[PDB]
Amino acid sequence: PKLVTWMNNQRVGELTKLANGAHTFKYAPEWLASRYARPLSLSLPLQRGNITSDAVFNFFDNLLPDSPIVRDRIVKRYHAKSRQPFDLLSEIGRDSVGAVTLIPEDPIMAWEKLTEARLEEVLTAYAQEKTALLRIGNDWCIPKGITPTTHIIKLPILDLSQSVDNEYYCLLLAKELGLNVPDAEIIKAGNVRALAVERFDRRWNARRTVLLRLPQEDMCQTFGLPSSVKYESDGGPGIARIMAFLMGSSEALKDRYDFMKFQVFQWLIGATQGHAKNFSVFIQAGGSYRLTPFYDIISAFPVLGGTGIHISDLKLAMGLNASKGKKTAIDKIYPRHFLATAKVLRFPEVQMHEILSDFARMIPAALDNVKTSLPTDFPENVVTAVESNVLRLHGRLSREY
Ligand SMILES: [Cl-]
Known part of the structure; x- marks a missing residue:
């Protein structure tokens, strides 16, 4: 009942789900010893003991989509043990928002380029339903292993059928008005139209040999x-x-x-x-x-x-x-x-x-x-x-x- 929590290549601690359903978190000693240590959340301050407050369940549950309909889809797609949080993250916790990478208790940058046909297929499988992909040059790709993604991809969602164009427009206007917002682009693959938003929780190193996750x-x-x-x-x-x-x-x-x-x-x-x-x-x-x-x-x-x-x-x-x-x-x-x-x-x-x-x-x-x-x-x-x-x-x- 453990998921090791990583921040890039550093072990942060472990998330445990006890037999009674309770979730606890414990920082790793090597993490705590670093003079540059930072908590996983301001709601989970650095400490040596087991953290057992509801802040643990709440923090990890907040990494997942809010929608029960989306969660059922996730269980179906990865055949997750249950709809429970610990079980969903066991399946999709490798690349999430921020820098937390959750790996089951049981690297080099690499990826696979997708063709327009393949990209269309990937996107047609998706509060709303959103995914993420790795951009390499002008190609959309699927990262391999622990290689992170660079863009959040959103599909069209009251007729919110043009939510892709709506958000593209809003982001452009915000940027034009001096607000701090991510860049985005409308991507078209076959008959699908999606919004690719550049992630600000990711950063390439100067040589472009390593893509880092930002907490x-x-x-x-x-x-x-x-x-x-x-x-x-x-x-x-x-x-x-x-x-x-x-x-x-x-x-x-x-x-x-x-x-x-x-x-x-x-x-x-x-x-x-x-x-x-x-x-x-x-x-x-x-x-x-x-x-x-x-x-x-x-x-x-x-x-x-x-x-x-x-x-x-x-x-x-x-x-x-x-x-x-x-x-x-x-x-x-x-x-x-x-x-x-x-x-x-x-x-x-x-x-x-x-x-x-x-x-x-x-x-x-x-x-x-x-x-x-x-x-x-x-x-x-x-x-x-x-x-x-x-x-x-x-x-x-x-x-x-
Ligand atoms: Cl009012």
């Missing part, structure tokens, strides 16, 4: 919480808890500014799904941390008017301060709410003003610039929907900034 954990993990409480309405962290947390980042000022800037950005693009698991931090040597780039960005604008949903129904996953409580409706949110929030969280008014004024003058040019990076077959309705609504909200920044 990171999302906000539920960092707080020892189960994925079940990822939404603030369920007791999960919101802007206040995360901002407080970021005070201790090795890049406090830049991370708080970036996180606040991103809240304004989600509001402008109608991103209604920015829950706690959509934020992560890199865990660095010694246990210090800093915010990773932003990810999993999708606009709810292209889904408007569909199932009868109006713009008035769009709500931010993490609310802002309101005179009498919180402000969550994108359609009712204005700059005063961001400034009121900045104030109570001790985020400088001058910085909040800069963020608002920068979007005020840059949005129109950013929207035009993004168009050159869209493929000829990009769905116009997505551009139309996001563009018109972003400009509509952007007007509110101009009637003051």
Whole structure:
């Protein structure tokens, strides 16, 4: 009942599942002795004894997809012993988010190039269902052994049939507006259209002979919480808890500014799904941390008017301060709410003003610039929907900034 936990080529410790179902973790002495040792999670601090808190089960369970439907698929695909976490990671824990590599108790870089036909096949087998591949030059490949992947691959997902184009667009816009986000590309293989997002939890060495995994954990993990409480309405962290947390980042000022800037950005693009698991931090040597780039960005604008949903129904996953409580409706949110929030969280008014004024003058040019990076077959309705609504909200920044 053990899975050895590795960080690149270093043994970190072991995950054990006792006979009664309890999960425990124990760091390896060689790991702890390193003057550069870092915990697996800020919720699992470095220590010599057996860790038995719920933070253990929660940390590892948060490495898996949230969806029971996706988990059944995983058990079926690898014939996993059960749907239980320990058993799923026994099958797919070799390459996961961050740098944790889980290998059953019972290297050289190598890979296999895939043909367009083969790539189409691989992708047609896949909250949503996502996989990962290794990019070598302009070819998509399957890594061999412990060789890591470099890109998260997402398939189309309320008609969220254009979620691939939606996210591509949002990521391009975020980058154009100065936000820290991964690059992405729309890949076409036969009749499949998927989004390949470059992973920021991976890094090639200078000579390109070794691809390293970078340790990171999302906000539920960092707080020892189960994925079940990822939404603030369920007791999960919101802007206040995360901002407080970021005070201790090795890049406090830049991370708080970036996180606040991103809240304004989600509001402008109608991103209604920015829950706690959509934020992560890199865990660095010694246990210090800093915010990773932003990810999993999708606009709810292209889904408007569909199932009868109006713009008035769009709500931010993490609310802002309101005179009498919180402000969550994108359609009712204005700059005063961001400034009121900045104030109570001790985020400088001058910085909040800069963020608002920068979007005020840059949005129109950013929207035009993004168009050159869209493929000829990009769905116009997505551009139309996001563009018109972003400009509509952007007007509110101009009637003051
Ligand atoms: Cl509201």
